[PDB]
Amino acid sequence: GSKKPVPIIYCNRRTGKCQRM
Amino acid sequence: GSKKPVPIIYCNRRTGKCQRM
């Protein structure tokens, strides 16, 4: 319940990946 | 100057702040 309610992510173009916080 | 083209940010609710990558 830390990233579910809050759509906080970070896509690192360097590695072409994205995840939630 | 890489986050300009790519709208990659990260708002840390913990500190209630958001910035670009």
Curated annotation (Swiss-Prot), chains A, B:
Disulfide bonds join 11-18. GO terms for biological process: defense response to bacterium; defense response to fungus; innate immune response; killing of cells of another organism. Keywords: Antibiotic, Antimicrobial, Disulfide bond, Fungicide, Immunity, Innate immunity, Secreted. The keyword Secreted applies. It is found in: Secreted. Signal peptide: none annotated. GO terms for cellular component: extracellular region. It comes from the Eukaryota. Its main location: secreted. Insect defense peptide with a broad spectrum of activity against Gram-positive and Gram-negative bacteria and fungi. No activity against S.aureus. Stops respiration in bacteria but does not permeabilize their inner membranes. Four regions are important for the activity: the C-terminal loop, the last three C-terminal residues, the stretch of seven N-terminal residues and residues 8-9 are necessary for the antifungal activity and dispensable for antibacterial activity. This is Thanatin.
